[PDB]
Amino acid sequence: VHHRALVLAQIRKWLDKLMFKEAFECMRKLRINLNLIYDHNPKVFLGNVETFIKQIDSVNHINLFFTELKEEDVTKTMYPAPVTSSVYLSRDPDGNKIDLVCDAMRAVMESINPHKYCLSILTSHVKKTTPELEIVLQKVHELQGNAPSDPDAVSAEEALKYLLHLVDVNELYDHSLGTYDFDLVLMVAEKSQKDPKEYLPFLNTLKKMETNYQRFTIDKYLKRYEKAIGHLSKCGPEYFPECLNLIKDKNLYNEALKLYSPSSQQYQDISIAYGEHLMQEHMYEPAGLMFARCGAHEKALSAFLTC
Amino acid sequence: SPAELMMLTIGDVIKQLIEAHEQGKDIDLNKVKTKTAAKYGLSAQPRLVDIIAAVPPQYRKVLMPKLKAKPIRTASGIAVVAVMCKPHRCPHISFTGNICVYCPGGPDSDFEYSTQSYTGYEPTSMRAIRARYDPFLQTRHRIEQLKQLGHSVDKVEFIVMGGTFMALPEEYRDYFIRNLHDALSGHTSNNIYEAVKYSERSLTKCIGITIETRPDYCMKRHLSDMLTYGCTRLEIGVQSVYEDVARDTNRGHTVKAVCESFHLAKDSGFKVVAHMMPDLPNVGLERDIEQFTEFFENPAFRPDGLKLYPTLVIRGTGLYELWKSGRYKSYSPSDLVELVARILALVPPWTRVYRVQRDIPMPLVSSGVEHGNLRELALARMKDLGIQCRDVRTREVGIQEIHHKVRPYQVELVRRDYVANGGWETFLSYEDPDQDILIGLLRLRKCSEETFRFELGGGVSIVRELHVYGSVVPVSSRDPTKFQHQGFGMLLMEEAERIAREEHGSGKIAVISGVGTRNYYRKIGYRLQGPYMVKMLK
Amino acid sequence: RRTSDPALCTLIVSAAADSAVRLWSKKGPEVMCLQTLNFGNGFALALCLSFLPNTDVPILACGNDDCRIHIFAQQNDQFQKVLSLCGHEDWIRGVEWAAFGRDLFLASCSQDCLIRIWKLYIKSTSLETQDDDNIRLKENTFTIENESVKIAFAVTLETVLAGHENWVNAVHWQPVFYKDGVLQQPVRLLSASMDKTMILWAPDEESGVWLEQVRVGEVGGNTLGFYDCQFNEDGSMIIAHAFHGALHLWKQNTVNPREWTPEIVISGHFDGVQDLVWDPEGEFIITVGTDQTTRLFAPWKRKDQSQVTWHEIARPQIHGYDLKCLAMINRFQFVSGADEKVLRVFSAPRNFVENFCAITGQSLNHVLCNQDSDLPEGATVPALGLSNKAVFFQPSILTEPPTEDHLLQNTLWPEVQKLYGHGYEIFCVTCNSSKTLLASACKAAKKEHAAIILWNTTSWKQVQNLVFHSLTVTQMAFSPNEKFLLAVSRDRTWSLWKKQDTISPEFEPVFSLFAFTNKITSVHSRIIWSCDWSPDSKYFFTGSRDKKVVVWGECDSTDDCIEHNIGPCSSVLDVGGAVTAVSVCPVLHPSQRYVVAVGLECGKICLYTWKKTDQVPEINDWTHCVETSQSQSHTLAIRKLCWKNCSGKTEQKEAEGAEWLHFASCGEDHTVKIHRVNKCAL
RNA sequence: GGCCCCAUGGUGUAAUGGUUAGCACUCUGGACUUUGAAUCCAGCGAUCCGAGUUCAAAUCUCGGUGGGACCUCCA
Ligand SMILES: CC(=O)SCCNC(=O)CCNC(=O)[C@H](O)C(C)(C)COP(=O)(O)OP(=O)(O)OC[C@H]1O[C@@H](n2cnc3c(N)ncnc32)[C@H](O)[C@@H]1OP(=O)(O)O
Ligand SMILES: C[C@H]1O[C@@H](n2cnc3c(N)ncnc32)[C@H](O)[C@@H]1O
Ligand code: MET
Ligand code: SF4
Ligand SMILES: [Mg+2]
Ligand SMILES: [Mg+2]
Ligand SMILES: [Mg+2]
Ligand SMILES: [Mg+2]
């Protein structure tokens, strides 16, 4: 048996002596959560990222490190310190731990070798708090139409396979459609197992449309109703009835009111619709107040009398 | 008519399910079933198989993780297909004049068109009878049923049942094995080697084959022949550790032969599973405890798996005649439950129990066991007495997940060493100590001085099994809520390659494997030699 | 295609199981191997050859187990890889090229249950490309050298069809054909799958999709699907090949263009045939085989034609054991013996007689001969076990031979008996000419198991046991005089049993040894495989693996011999190989001709003519008469030979002077044949 | 249109103002590496919808909704 006390004592000594290689190997073999590398002393880790990167020096190991990072602190839920004589706490982590870790390590990796560390930078981008799929798709597209210079580069086929490994095909297809770039859409749809004569006419129809109407149509096709109504609003007056129909259908009254200035008559129309909606939900006093605000005085009488 | 009403109810159920999936909310199936059946005026409820058998293709792909039926059928990490041979006579009928005193059925019996030690009313027996004992049809039919339930059949393991398979003519065995491999792969071959090559290049992986055999049919010739077939597991019936019982029941061999066969099989690289039978004649209530204590404490006997089969008396056998004459009486049910609890309390943590009682229909039994859930009754009795069972089956993630509601939290690495059958055995595992939950295991053995295979002579250490439990994850896929494809296998092999070089002192390591496993080990860095996957350690 | 006026040069490509593909060229009677291609440890599962458009450069497409198609082009004098096409994710089971206008199409099927169509065309002239306001799939491009000229070609996917559940086993375009001079080039596709179905596809001109047009097959039952499918010249007929070996043929109606009907096709066993018998009156034959089936063949008579064709009409057994032996008791009743310790007896139902008399062109009243009377109507599979149960299946009158869906179900025969008394699996059965007795034998390794058993045909009980020999009895024969029984065995010996004479009308006669043979007296050095009687019950012939056929004679004079005079009455003949069948024609000629039909392991059938020398020299007793040709012979061992002993027609009333004699043969090459020989020649 | 009665699990049905609704058919899960369907043993699932009177209502008063009995009216 490997008793946890001896292992933890040795690991703490190793971490305090800046010998990340041995600690990493021991934690990997014995299945100890890797977060303890950072949570033991965040300041020292963020001050010596270069030595960490140089000592780990493996794409697979760094990828393993990224697929285990979590916001929670393990020195308070899994491995409490046996001695309570903590020297201090000092600087509270300013932001999301994942964000600082990813940004610092990506900066060091880019400074040391852009070509050797290729899939790990993409993993750092994907694993952040907000998945930046657009940036990684754009980088893959750049790598598609280019020639190598240093015989350590990764082919676009392997990068696409790794991205399909991280994220599902259909989700990538939807994100690419959201990017408003048909090159990326075609790239993803190539390895999608779909009939070309089912989406080629669809993309062609989407192409020959006005820009704002195109964006509204795509957004509606991908839910994203707020962006769809914004894009439709940024168009001609004749489309306003359809915009109002969508506003009423999904109850987007507040966003529409934010979209236009109060002096606009469209603001008055949306206000009247919103007040009628509250009439449907028995909020007589609020909708009457907002009728009085917009100018529907008689409806204010009706609602105020009802309430 | 009720039929169209049923169809409309089903269609409405899938309509609601797919709608809820489209706008992305969770839905409770039972309430929807009851409400929708209320509308159309029915007097029954929908069945899960019917709802599964009407989904459109893309939705069929997407929404199976909610409509699956019988989640136990793939809760151990594989899919099991059982096939049966042609009826035949046991080999020892000639030089003794008769067969074992308690075996029912067979070619010369009143159970028409049934294999030895079976009645024909069993589930698998009725499947092969209507297929007229054809391996291709049986494999196809069983895979179709498993797919209809809603399971994944990426990884398959065969079990060949019947009498003594290795006592049949060579041509029939060739036919059977090549047809099994062809049914998996899809080729149309002429002999074993062609089928093995094509199955190696296949996409529906054949993990291994299991064969049941007698101790006198397990020699160097038979072991080599089974090695060429792709077999990796053996089932032998020991039934007792007492020498007088083995000759008063006309068994036909001796216990020493059993021990020698164990030694040869384990040195060759197989896995051994033993059938044992309590309540045999001339064995009281006190010799059973001693029998099993010796079984699990004596190095000559320690197996890897166990099958407990309490004795049943069936018509048309010698034991039936003994029972009629008022000379044999069975245990009382309370005594039987107590005995089974005591026996299960002794199993070491490296042994797996596959089954606990036979499956003969109740009306055909004259005396003996009458219930049908002996295992859970024994477990409840064990909980009452204060003792606990610690075998392999009742400690893995899937069983602990469906019987109880627990999940691993603090996984650690454990190693156990012992001596068995003249060899030095090690057992490596990844498991959670506090909650007693098993995840993955590996078995390693140092070859003794009496190995006969050419590939294993001169300093070779052999790996006998590697396994990771949970639900089935299809090849090249990943699921973060399951346990398989997360790197527990290359961690278990790196440690096995360190013991074999710094402690055993060997200079080569060999693995016995299937075919998909052949590709896996090729990925790791092993090459092929004979029927083994070998690698230099120097 | 070339303009040097060659002797039709041919290019051949082959792929095998040694992970290699080979190319060959055949210029006249000369062949030579141009190239070999190695795929490592993979395999090639499909091949197709054609030429690039608007040129004469051959191109090759190979489907592999890698779920990936490979394209090769022959520039210079060798084949070089140009392109690799992905998209599939399972094994590929068929590719095919097609030429349409100035473009080339490729159709591909796989075990993914999907069909894909690609398209190869000639790329533009590197100009006139300015419509950048469109969305198009990326093109796969390659360049070739031709007469010091660079030509660029492009490949792009066209469509992805779907609609199958199980594997797709084959796919084929539609061949071009000529109507009144003009060539018509339809666009159609055919697919056959493992889920018992065939689908025909055609494109749609209103949109850019393909639609199913006809879906043919039988969905349901444990029977598996299809392996291959083929078109006709013009598309009127479609054929498909089933899992066991059955053939299905469909024809399209002239007026109704979406209706297809099945038709009559050849059929036969899908494994080795083991035994054969003739109709006592000679209008059908019955065969059994190791495929666990029993089949009946009878001729078809049609008014508006002269030639007669024989077709299967009955399959009166689908058993759970390999069948080994069969014998005939009455005109509609037989006995069968399989790989079990039990003999079985089958009789015929009523609808079979009506169908038989309808197809063969006889009269229903006269075929009954007012002697069958009432009897069951059909048979069906029992709920449990192996048996036949009378359904006293469905009344289905027939005027034409059935198809392979009415034969499988509605054409069984009831079981009316079951005999026990043997300790092991059966090996041989025979019957006498008086229709009241029966013999049997079984596999044995000692003397107490190898024993002949005699039965009765009116009340089936054992009559007497004849214990002799120590090994299996291979064949037995009743002399036409109904006063002898002979046996030959694996122990290189034989024995003759004579029936003693009693009047005792209520009793039954008995048999006892009349002659025998030990190790020394035996002349065959190895296993004896066959024996037969002379038509006058005088001599008998034996054939063994010693490549020799011997005549033992003077078995007549049953009145009173001292003990016997049985011995070799001829000279041994070295045929050339092991003999596994012997038969003697049941026709007597004044010149005393005894013709013997000898079969061998290699499927040869030799007719000799044996003549008794009547002199102390034994030369001029073996004469070679005729031998089968290389296309008329078999390919594996011959297991039976049986002349047409038309005892019902004792003298041929309506015959052309009996110019011809007929007989039949079967063997382990899945084949049953009927041969005819000129009478006056022999 | 008034005129008497009926309504509890998906279906057939039990129970008296208490201090928390029982059985059958159907359905789901385990013994089970010999089994969706068989055996044994566990489990999920209801007093239509409103007002209410009595300390307290599935239970008694009055309602709407459907149904059953009488003639409808009506065209
Ligand atoms: C050799 C024998 O006796 S049998 C092995 C046990 N049999 C079984 O398949 C039952 C369960 N087995 C398993 O859990 C796995 O198949 C094992 C034991 C072989 C490996 O366990 P894991 O921890 O899942 O392996 P690990 O996560 O280290 O490796 C994952 C990789 O193996 C691949 N892999 C897994 N099984 C196979 C296989 N049969 N053939 C080929 N590749 C395979 C996965 O596709 C994955 O590759 P990728 O993600 O790079 O594309
Ligand atoms: C197939 C296995 O069944 C067991 N077996 C055989 N006969 C009986 C019986 N009467 N009762 C219980 N188990 C039996 C033996 O252990 C055999 O190996
Ligand atoms: C099917 S019984 C178990 C296998 C073998 N007949 C034995 O007795 O060992
Ligand atoms: S060897 Fe096994 S199968 Fe054969 S008779 Fe004995 S117990 Fe039955
Ligand atoms: Mg009700
Ligand atoms: Mg009631
Ligand atoms: Mg009540
Ligand atoms: Mg059940």
Numbering used by the authors:
A (entry chain A): 719 to 1025
B (entry chain C): 10 to 547
C (entry chain B): 119 to 510, 537 to 826
Paper text:
The Elongator complex is responsible for introducing 5-carboxymethyl at wobble uridine bases (cm5U34) in eukaryotic tRNAs. The highly conserved complex is composed of two copies of each of its six individual protein subunits, Elp1-Elp6, which form two discrete subcomplexes known as Elp123 and Elp456. The modification reaction requires S-adenosylmethionine (SAM) and acetyl-CoA as cofactors. tRNA binding to Elp123 triggers SAM cleavage and acetyl-CoA hydrolysis that provide the required reactive groups for cm5U34 formation. In this study, we present a series of cryo-EM structures of human ELP123 in complex with tRNA and cofactors at four different stages of the reaction.
Next, we conducted a structural characterization of the ELP123–tRNA–acetyl-CoA complex using single-particle cryo-EM. After 3D reconstruction and refinement, the obtained density resembles a 2-lobed architecture, known from other eukaryotic Elp123 complexes. However, while one ELP123 lobe is fully resolved the second lobe is only partially visible. The final map has an overall resolution of 2.87 Å (FSC0.143), with some regions reaching a local resolution of 2.6 Å. In our ELP123–tRNA–acetyl-CoA reconstruction, we identified a well-resolved ligand density that unambiguously fits a complete acetyl-CoA molecule, confirming that the native ligand is bound in a similar fashion as acetyl-CoA in GCN5 and DCA in bacterial DmcElp3. The acetyl group of acetyl-CoA reaches deep into the catalytic cleft of ELP3. Acetyl-CoA is predominantly bound through its phosphate groups, which are coordinated by a Gly-Gly motif (Gly496 and Gly498), and several residues located in a loop of ELP3 (aa477-497), hereafter called the “acetyl-CoA loop”. The tail of acetyl-CoA reaches deep into the catalytic cleft, where it positions the acetyl group close to Lys280. The high quality of the ELP123–tRNA–acetyl-CoA map allowed us to precisely trace almost the entire tRNA molecule de novo. We find well-defined densities for most tRNA nucleotides, with a slightly weaker coverage in the tRNA elbow region, as well as the acceptor stem that points away from the complex and does not make any direct contacts with ELP123.
